[PDB]
Amino acid sequence: SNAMYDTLIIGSGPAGMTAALYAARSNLSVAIIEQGAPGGQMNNTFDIENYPGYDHISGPELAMKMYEPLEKFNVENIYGIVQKIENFGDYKCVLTEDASYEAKTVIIATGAKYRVLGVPGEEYYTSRGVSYCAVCDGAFFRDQDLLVVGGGDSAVEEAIYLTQFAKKVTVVHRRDQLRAQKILQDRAFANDKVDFIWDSVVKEIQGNDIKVSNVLIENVKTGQVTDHAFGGVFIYVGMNPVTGMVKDLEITDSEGWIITDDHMRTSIPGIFAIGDVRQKDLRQITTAVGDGAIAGQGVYHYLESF
Amino acid sequence: SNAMYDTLIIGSGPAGMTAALYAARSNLSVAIIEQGAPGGQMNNTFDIENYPGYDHISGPELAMKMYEPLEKFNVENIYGIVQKIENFGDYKCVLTEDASYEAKTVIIATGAKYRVLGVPGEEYYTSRGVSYCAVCDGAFFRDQDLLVVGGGDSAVEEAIYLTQFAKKVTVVHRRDQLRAQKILQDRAFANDKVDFIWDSVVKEIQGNDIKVSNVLIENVKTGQVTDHAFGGVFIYVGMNPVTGMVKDLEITDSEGWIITDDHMRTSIPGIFAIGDVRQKDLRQITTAVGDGAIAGQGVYHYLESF
Ligand SMILES: Cc1cc2nc3c(=O)[nH]c(=O)nc-3n(C[C@H](O)[C@H](O)[C@H](O)COP(=O)(O)OP(=O)(O)OC[C@H]3O[C@@H](n4cnc5c(N)ncnc54)[C@H](O)[C@@H]3O)c2cc1C
Numbered sequence: 001s002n003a004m005y006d007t008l009i010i011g012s013g014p015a016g017m018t019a020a021l022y023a024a025r026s027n028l029s030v031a032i033i034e035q036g037a038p039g040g041q042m043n044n045t046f047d048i049e050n051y052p053g054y055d056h057i058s059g060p061e062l063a064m065k066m067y068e069p070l071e072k073f074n075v076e077n078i079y080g081i082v083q084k085i086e087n088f089g090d091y092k093c094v095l096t097e098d099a100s101y102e103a104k105t106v107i108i109a110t111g112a113k114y115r116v117l118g119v120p121g122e123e124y125y126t127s128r129g130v131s132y133c134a135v136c137d138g139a140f141f142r143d144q145d146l147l148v149v150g151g152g153d154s155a156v157e158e159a160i161y162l163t164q165f166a167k168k169v170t171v172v173h174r175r176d177q178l179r180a181q182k183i184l185q186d187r188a189f190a191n192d193k194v195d196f197i198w199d200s201v202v203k204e205i206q207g208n209d210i211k212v213s214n215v216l217i218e219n220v221k222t223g224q225v226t227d228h229a230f231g232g233v234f235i236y237v238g239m240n241p242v243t244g245m246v247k248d249l250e251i252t253d254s255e256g257w258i259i260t261d262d263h264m265r266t267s268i269p270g271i272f273a274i275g276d277v278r279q280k281d282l283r284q285i286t287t288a289v290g291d292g293a294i295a296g297q298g299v300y301h302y303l304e305s306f
Numbered sequence: 307s308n309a310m311y312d313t314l315i316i317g318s319g320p321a322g323m324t325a326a327l328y329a330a331r332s333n334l335s336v337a338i339i340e341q342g343a344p345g346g347q348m349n350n351t352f353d354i355e356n357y358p359g360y361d362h363i364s365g366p367e368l369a370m371k372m373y374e375p376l377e378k379f380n381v382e383n384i385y386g387i388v389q390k391i392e393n394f395g396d397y398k399c400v401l402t403e404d405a406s407y408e409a410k411t412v413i414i415a416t417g418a419k420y421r422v423l424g425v426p427g428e429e430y431y432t433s434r435g436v437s438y439c440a441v442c443d444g445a446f447f448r449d450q451d452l453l454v455v456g457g458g459d460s461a462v463e464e465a466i467y468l469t470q471f472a473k474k475v476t477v478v479h480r481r482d483q484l485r486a487q488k489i490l491q492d493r494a495f496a497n498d499k500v501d502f503i504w505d506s507v508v509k510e511i512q513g514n515d516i517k518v519s520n521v522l523i524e525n526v527k528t529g530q531v532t533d534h535a536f537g538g539v540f541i542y543v544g545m546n547p548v549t550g551m552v553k554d555l556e557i558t559d560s561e562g563w564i565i566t567d568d569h570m571r572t573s574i575p576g577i578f579a580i581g582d583v584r585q586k587d588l589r590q591i592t593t594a595v596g597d598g599a600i601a602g603q604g605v606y607h608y609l610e611s612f
């Protein structure tokens with residue numbers, strides 16, 4: 001089994017860990033290849049209040065509470081940064097920067113990464129006033145003032161979604177026009193709680209080491225900086241799926257997200273994808289948990305029908 | 307909102323409760339109509355070890371740990387047994403045996419019910435040696451003897467899945483032939499750890515008030531009873547989706563499971579179905595949690611595009 005696993009799972013987020021739980025619980029050889037801390041994007045989240053069974057919990061302690069039940073089920077944890085996964089039909093290879101492992105099934109759970117703005121203080125106050133997920137932390141900033149960065153569909157729709165909690169939502173954008181659909185533009189201009197600052201760029205995010213308190217906004221045309229008071233900032237600039245190690249396999253779309261079906265299975269038989277690395281709409285721990293369960297239990301079926 | 311909810315959720319299992327969590331967290335009027343105890347089929351499960359974030363936990367305490375965070379989010383809990391849900395386009399009605407409520411969206415989370423055998427002691431030792439779910443409690447009965455009831459695809463495949471933990475698996479069936487596919491029949495006859503008892507019916511399940519210890523098996527041809535020692539019994543006879551209150555809507559299949567797509571939405575716009583009441587393959591708390599999250603967050607989108 002060391003020479004050839006029943007399942008190797010690339011990634012240790014909620015998805016990968018759930019697939020490992022189900023697959024190993026079914027008495028299969030399971031190993032997770034993880035670059036760094038078990039938890040993924042979770043280790044960057046202050047508080048989480050939309051995972052059922054937990055009123056409130058932080059990223060790291062929930063990651064550990066998901067990881068520790070794996071040792072009981074013989075999940076072998078392997079450090080590594082996967083560079084390539086190649087298919088051989090009856091078996092597949094997964095290559096490290098210094099090792100390489102064989103498995104009958106590969107489950108891809110590498111997730112994605114929120115693109116960033118490049119602003120001093122955004123790293124600092126991330127998940128403390130800075131957020132890239134309105135569905136995620138929007139309910140924490142009730143009756144406060146929020147700043148939304150962007151001018152596409154994502155920024156506008158996430159802004160009017162944020163109107164469900166905040167007293168006011170202002171969006172910044174480095175231009176005088178929106179590139180979003182005219183329907184959502186009209187919907188935004190119609191909502192009272194949203195106003196916008198045109199031809200401007202976020203210069204720097206400032207707070208009191210605890211929360212975000214204010215942001216310095218620079219105007220691209222004039223060049224002068226003015227400070228504004230905001231309880232929160234939400235930025236959406238796009239996201240990067242971690243799919244560099246499956247470019248050879250033609251399982252991704254144009255933007256690089258892996259294509260699967262109801263059963264988490266890929267156009268390549270034996271390889272599955274779960275979680276946020278997937279083509280999907282709602283990217284949450286609850287969705288990654290559903291997904292991971294489906295792949296972990298599907299591994300047994302694929303192996304049995306052999 | 308009392309006269310017309312943003313969302314009414316029929317059912318209080320993991321699915322319904324997760325949809326209520328997400329929908330209410332998005333600042334929407336949410337009420338759950340539940341017949342009885344919050345938890346659904348969970349309140350019948352001894353131990354659960356495949357829900358991420360919890361090493362081991364019982365049905366009731368996990369149900370409560372999922373329910374209590376709802377009061378914080380203004381989820382209104384309404385007792386009732388839904389008899390009919392009718393559609394009016396912009397709005398829908400949900401009828402009790404004595405009341406009736408209007409909502410802009412209905413989420414159907416009524417789940418299903420495991421059909422039973424009608425045997426004395428099966429009720430008693432349910433989830434204590436009696437189980438209707440091999441994926442669920444199969445990993446508890448490692449290196450023991452297990453009895454599988456049935457002769458279709460479900461019984462055979464669940465039996466050879468049970469070979470991954472048990473030392474031996476014997477299946478009972480009231481006939482001399484199997485009605486399963488010949489491929490799975492051959493696969494079963496090929497496995498060493500499975501043997502079968504033909505032309506027999508389970509007469510009664512017996513134990514020590516804690517575990518299942520033995521079962522009395524009657525032969526349909528002779529009529530004589532013989533006792534056999536089994537650590538576990540797993541029965542699959544089919545399942546009944548709770549879809550009596552949506553017969554009018556043509557959203558079910560021939561067997562009565564609700565048809566949805568990726569987004570949990572039904573052929574009827576505004577009505578969603580989640581959890582085990584759905585047409586799906588893997589029915590777990592993790593799948594119901596994914597599903598419920600998707601519907602709860604989709605309610606906001608459907609309402610906004612109005
Ligand atoms: C600021 C912020 C706030 C959030 N708020 C919430 C919230 O309120 N609620 C909520 O439910 N979720 C929240 N999330 C999490 C969100 O749901 C994520 O999308 C989710 O954690 C993704 O899970 P996943 O397992 O699919 O992917 P991830 O957890 O992102 O998986 C990434 C993992 O893959 C590994 N990996 C990647 N490439 C390689 C490689 N080549 N080799 C080896 N390992 C590799 C990484 O090391 C990491 O462990 C938040 C995230 C962030 C960043």
Ligand SMILES: Cc1cc2nc3c(=O)[nH]c(=O)nc-3n(C[C@H](O)[C@H](O)[C@H](O)COP(=O)(O)OP(=O)(O)OC[C@H]3O[C@@H](n4cnc5c(N)ncnc54)[C@H](O)[C@@H]3O)c2cc1C
Nearest residue numbers: 317319320321341346347387388416417442581582590591
């Ligand atoms: C013996 C047993 C063992 C199990 N073991 C496991 C396990 O190991 N792991 C695991 O993850 N899960 C386990 N389960 C649970 C399984 O995953 C279930 O399929 C799951 O709980 C279904 O969730 P759901 O919300 O989709 O449906 P359910 O939880 O079944 O939803 C049923 C709910 O709908 C309500 N309802 C139905 N009709 C009406 C109506 N007309 N009006 C009002 N309310 C109505 C009921 O009152 C109930 O609250 C087990 C279940 C059983 C019975």
